[PDB]
Each structure stands twice: as C-alpha cells, then as structure tokens.
C-alpha cells in the first residue's frame, strides 16, 4: 500500500518520519551456564520492527493519513515502508539476467551476474529476494568478477526455487499496524493532531 512518504507525495510535508527505529526483533532462547558458557538457540522468526513517530499534523495531512490507514485496515493488504537511509541506489542496472542456483539456503546467497549488474554493494545495505516479502541486510561481500557471494543476516526465510532474483533498490518492508487496536489522535486547541505514532512489524 506504500504508507505515504515525501517521495510518494511531497505536497503534504510532515508525513515524513522524524524517528525511524529498526527493532532487530530476534526471539531467541538463551541459557547462562555456571561453566561460563552462554548457550543460545534460534527458533521462531525474525521480524524487523519499525517504530515510526510523527510530528504535529495539520488537518489536511492527518486526513490523508487517516484515508490511507483506513484503506490499509478495511483491506487485508500490508503496509509498505521505504526507509530513506538505506536508499543508497548502489548496484544499479537491471536484475532480470542474474540467476541464483537451484537450492541455496543457509544465510549465504551466491548469485552470478553476467553483465547486467554494475556496482559492488557495501556491507550493510538491505537485500531482498524478488518472490519473498522480507528484506535481508548484507553482512559481508565477495566477488569473483561475475559470481559474487552475498551473506545475509536473516537466515533466508524462503528456500531457493531457481528463478529467484535480487532487488537491491526500492524495497518495501511489508508491515502491519501493531497499534491498530488502540489508534487515536488528540486534536489539540491549536487544531493540530498530535501524539500519532506508528509501531510497525513485518508480515512476511
């Protein structure tokens, strides 16, 4: 649905985020032995939690935001959020000709690019597989001219079918409101709707 951003529509300023918080929510069981060791096991999943806070909103901007959020609620579609700090627009080119091997799995994607991708990404840029909603952050990189190995922090929630393709640009966090239960906005004396903050969690 693409939650409104200044890139999406700049005629309503102040709908830009004033504080973006990627909560690296990683549910995980840890035990602390007397031996000194720390034993820890990964189960469940890992949802990127986005904590958006908004400034005071004039009636027009808040009316538009209610329109979009009610469109989100009455429909079953997921919120899409673009984080500008990661919109580095490296890599560049097209992603149709790149191929991923048959079944990759295990937090490392080794994709080979023939001539269609021109540019080495930096460790820490978000990476997404075309078919599966969730977005991964890169932790290391290594290239051999055409074949470059990419290491991902989330452990590849989807397996590889053989037609998967990277995105590298314009990714959107598929998210759902976690504040939908009690979503209110006080309209002050001044006439500006205040205290409207959004808590978002991925819905891969």
């Amino acid at each position: 649905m693409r939650l409104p951003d200044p890139y999406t529509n700049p005629e309503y300023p102040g709908l830009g985020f004033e504080s973006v918080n990627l909560v690296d929510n990683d549910p995980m069981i840890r035990d602390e032995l007397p031996n000194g060791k720390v034993k820890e096991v990964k189960i469940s999943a890992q949802y990127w939690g986005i904590n958006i806070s908004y400034p005071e909103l004039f009636p027009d901007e808040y009316a538009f935001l209610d329109s979009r959020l009610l469109e989100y609620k009455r429909t079953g579609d997921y919120l899409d959020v673009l984080l500008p700090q990661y919109e580095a627009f490296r890599v560049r080119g097209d992603t149709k000709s790149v191929t991923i091997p048959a079944g990759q799995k295990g937090s490392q994607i080794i994709l080979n690019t023939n001539g269609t991708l021109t540019g080495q990404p930096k460790a820490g840029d978000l990476f997404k597989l075309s078919t599966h909603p969730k977005v991964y952050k890169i932790t290391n990189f290594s290239s051999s001219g055409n074949v470059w190995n990419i290491s991902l922090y989330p452990d590849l929630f989807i397996t590889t079918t053989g037609s998967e393709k990277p995105v590298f640009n314009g990714i959107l966090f598929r998210t759902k409101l976690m504040n939908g239960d009690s979503f209110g906005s006080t309209l002050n004396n001044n006439g500006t709707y205040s205290g409207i903050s959004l808590s978002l969690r991925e819905s891969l």
């Binding site: 069981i29 035990d31 032995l33 034993k39 096991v41 189960i43």
Partner: protein
C-alpha cells in the same frame, strides 16, 4: 511378589530391594542439550566437589526433554551393593504339601482265613466303609459306630 514363584530368586530380589531402600537419595537438577538422549534408567556419575562426591553412581529417575533444549533430570542413589547380591541358605526340607484335602483309605488290609484287617482311616470324618466283590452286585457296608 505376585509374579515370582522361586523361593530363592524372590529371596534375592527381596534382598536387593531392601538394600535399594537402604540407599534412598534423590538429586534433582538440569543439564544442557549436550546430554540429549539420557533415559530415565541410565547410569550417571555425579561429581560435585564440595560434597566430597567424586564419582558417585546414580540412576536417573526423571528426564524432561524440553523444547528449549535443557533436560530436567532427577536422580536416585544406587550403589553397587544392591546389585552385588548375597548368599542364601538351603530351603528344601521345609516343604508343605497339601495332604489335608482328601480322605485317607484304610491303613492296612489283608485277608486272613473276613477281610477285617482294614485299620480305621486317619480321617475322623468317616461314616461307612464300602466293600465291592467281583460278583456281588450289592456292595457291603461296614459302619464306624465306634
């Protein structure tokens, strides 16, 4: 013992279970996932240093496999003395057959030239003896009046 019919093996089993009762110690602790596979009657040797416990034979009494990975063990203390077993005494002359469920016949009998020789049965539940001849269809009746 509902299932054991040997005097001697039940004797040894009673001795073993008595000594097992004599030991009677329980530990209860948790172990990490390294020790997966522990089974509720497996031998382990627990070696807490302060107690003075160097290798001490315990058989586990509980295992609680957990989704997280930790195992919640419970121990029972069985030294080698319970399994080493002991010696038993001969018990063969002290048999008690069930002789006391049938009436006994005349003690002696011979024919002296009538057939009188039958000594009264040791069973005092006796009323009338019966004599059956080869050709006489109607058997005789001799009655224990005294």
């Amino acid at each position: 013992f509902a299932n054991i019919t040997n005097y001697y093996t039940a004797r040894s089993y009673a001795d073993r279970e008595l000594k097992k009762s004599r030991y009677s110690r329980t530990l209860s602790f948790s172990v990490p996932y390294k020790f997966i596979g522990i089974e509720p009657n497996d031998p382990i040797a627990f070696t807490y240093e302060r107690y003075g416990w160097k290798d001490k034979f315990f058989l586990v009494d509980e295992v609680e496999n957990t989704r997280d990975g930790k195992i919640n063990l419970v121990l029972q203390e069985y030294g080698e003395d319970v399994f080493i077993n002991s010696e038993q005494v001969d018990n063969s002359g002290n048999d008690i057959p069930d002789i006391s469920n049938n009436v006994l016949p005349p003690r002696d009998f011979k024919y002296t030239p009538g057939e009188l020789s039958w000594l009264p049965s040791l069973t005092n539940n006796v009323v009338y003896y019966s004599i059956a001849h080869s050709g006489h269809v109607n058997p005789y009746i001799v009655q224990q009046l005294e």
